[PDB]
């Protein structure tokens, strides 16, 4: 590419992998959201919480793709695997799966940062530090807070209703 400068093939490939990860995460949240929209689950605040996250993760993928083109890398898309579950259980079960998912995204961001440091790619470093790293830390904190409140409320049916009504 005529514009490519200081952009390693290793980072280019890792950015493509991270896009697949973010799109996978968006798909997982789409599934979570619609599960809570089921007439036999029916927790609107939980559905909305996850649908909002689906959007956020899709936007993350799009930010990575824009950056890939800015650096003169080439987007390569792969199959997107279906979410790990078809049914997500209680709000607690779902929030547990969500924090696991966010930690995996966070670790992937940290790995990419490490790669960028190794390749002396300060533009990549800044990009991740600016658009991703703190967003992830904040989200994981919020999920931790929710998990604690969910667990304090477990009795169980009453707690799930109240959390959806009064927190979400």
Ligand X SMILES: *CC(F)(F)OCC(F)(F)F
Residues within window 41-70 making contact with ligand X, judged by CB under 6 A = 54, 57-58
Count of residues in contact with ligand X, rule CB under 6 A: 8
Count of residues in contact with a second copy, rule CB under 8 A: 82
Instruction: Assign 91 to helix, strand or coil.
Output: helix
Contact residue for ligand X among 11, 15, 21, 23 (CB under 6 A):
23
Closer to a second copy by Cβ: residue 38 or 52:
38
Q: Print the binding letters for residues 68-97 with ligand X: x by CB under 6 A, - otherwise.
A: ------------x-----------------
Between CA 125 and CA 52, with CA 50 as vertex, the angle to 5 degrees is: 65
Between CA 155 and CA 147, with CA 158 as vertex, the angle to 5 degrees is: 80
Closest CA to 140 of 167, 166, 113, 106: 106
Between CA 135 and CA 21, with CA 59 as vertex, the angle to 5 degrees is: 80
CB 140 within 8 A of CB 103: yes
**Shortest Å distance, C-beta 147 to a second copy:** 6
Within 69-98, which residues bind a second copy (CB under 8 A)? Answer: 69-72, 74-83, 86
Instruction: Assign 107 to helix, strand or coil.
Output: helix
Partner that binds at residue 13, options ligand X, a second copy, none, CB closer than 5 to 8 Å by kind:
none
Closest CA to 41 of 83, 89, 86: 89
Partner that binds at residue 39, options ligand X, a second copy, none, CB closer than 5 to 8 Å by kind:
a second copy
Within 93-132, which residues bind ligand X (CB under 6 A)? Answer: none
Contact residue for ligand X among 8, 16, 26, 91 (CB under 6 A):
26
């Amino acid at each position: 590419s005529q514009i490519r400068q200081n952009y390693s093939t290793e980072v280019e490939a890792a950015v493509n992998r991270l896009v697949n990860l973010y799109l996978r995460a968006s798909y997982t949240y789409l599934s979570l959201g619609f599960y809570f929209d089921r007439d036999d689950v029916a927790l609107e605040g939980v559905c909305h919480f996850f649908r909002e996250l689906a959007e956020e993760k899709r936007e993350g993928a799009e930010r990575l793709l824009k950056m890939q083109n800015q650096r003169g890398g080439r987007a390569l898309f792969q199959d997107l695997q279906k979410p790990s579950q078809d049914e997500w259980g209680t709000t607690l079960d779902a929030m547990k799966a969500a924090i696991v998912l966010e930690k995996s995204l966070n670790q992937a961001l940290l790995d990419l940062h490490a790669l960028g440091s190794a390749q002396a790619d300060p533009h990549l470093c800044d990009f991740l530090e600016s658009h991703f790293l703190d967003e992830e830390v904040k989200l994981i904190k919020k999920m931790g807070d929710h998990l604690t409140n969910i667990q304090r409320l477990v009795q169980a049916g009453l707690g799930e209703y109240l959390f959806e009504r009064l927190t979400l």
